[PDB]
């Protein structure tokens, strides 16, 4: 699975996710990636999110939308919402993975509960940061 999130100069947010799924999946299986609110979500009022991991749990937990709702309704910061979803809620359901997220103010988070997550981020006009393993 791969993905991207962004905040543009007009203040608009967007998210995209794409995948081949999981190795040896049953033909016809659909994971979180193509499901709005599960593997991909964007709303100018809150956040843009793209997920990766054990798809089934991200669907059951509506991971991407949950970040948005925790911020919007719960008043949590992007960091707090990410901590709750990725480090607490997903593991409790037996889910492994992570996500990338940008909120409407330009805060960025790349939480994951796995050994690694291929990732990168950068502000326009600045040098980007890359990563594979745990911070």
């Amino acid at each position: 699975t791969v993905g991207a999130v962004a905040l543009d100069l007009d203040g608009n947010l967007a998210a995209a996710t794409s995948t081949g799924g999981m190795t040896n999946k049953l033909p016809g299986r659909v994971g979180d990636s193509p499901l709005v609110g599960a593997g991909c979500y964007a709303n100018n009022a809150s956040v843009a999110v793209s997920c990766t991991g054990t798809g089934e749990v991200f669907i059951r937990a509506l991971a991407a939308y949950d970040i948005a709702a925790l911020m919007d309704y719960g008043g949590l910061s992007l960091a707090e919402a990410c901590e709750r979803v990725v480090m607490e809620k997903l593991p409790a359901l037996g889910g492994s993975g992570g996500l990338i997220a940008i909120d409407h103010e330009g805060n960025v988070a790349l939480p994951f509960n796995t050994e690694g997550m291929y990732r990168a981020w950068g502000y326009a006009g600045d040098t980007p940061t890359t990563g594979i393993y745990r911070e």
């Binding site: 967007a14 994971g31 193509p34 593997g39 990338i100 990732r119 990168a120």
Partner: protein
């Protein structure tokens, strides 16, 4: 407020002990190239929607990452691809699931959002919808790599 992009190429068991720095750098270089492309687009005033679509297209094209070229295999040694795009400004979204004859699922997803009243299309119907609108039909073996095939063979 500053424009910004983040990308990912998947989360999972990535073992540093089994890797060399030069092996790691191939992923780092790939990620940097794509994020830099997105940054430039943002700096130039391109839309968030266009930036995420292009970044994901590039991640699809890369064989290092499990999307598009380099997709994992199903139990039957086939490829079935899924993608979604969402515009935070309009709350419109487009998605395709279970496609095998479209090179870039994210572009098909974007096509659903922009050229139909729908959000999600699957399988043959999604493919026909795209073909009728100029998107080219491909054979799924274009996505196959020995790396992912060995992973299937090993998973068996």
């Amino acid at each position: 407020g500053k424009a910004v992009i983040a990308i990912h190429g998947g989360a999972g068991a990535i073992s540093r002990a089994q890797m060399s720095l030069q092996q790691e750098l191939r992923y780092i270089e790939a990620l940097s190239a794509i994020v830099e492309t997105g940054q430039k687009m943002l700096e130039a005033g391109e839309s968030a929607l266009d930036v995420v679509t292009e970044a994901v297209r590039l991640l699809e094209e890369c064989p290092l990452f499990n999307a598009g070229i380099g997709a994992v295999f199903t139990r039957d040694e086939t490829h079935e691809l899924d993608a979604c795009v969402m515009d935070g400004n309009t709350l419109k979204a487009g998605a395709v699931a279970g496609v095998s004859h479209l090179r870039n699922p994210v572009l098909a997803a974007r096509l659903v959002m922009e050229q139909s009243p729908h959000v999600m299309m699957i399988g043959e119907g999604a493919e026909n919808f795209a073909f009728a609108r100029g998107m080219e039909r491909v054979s799924p073996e274009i996505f196959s790599t020995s790396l992912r095939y060995e992973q299937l063979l090993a998973a068996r």
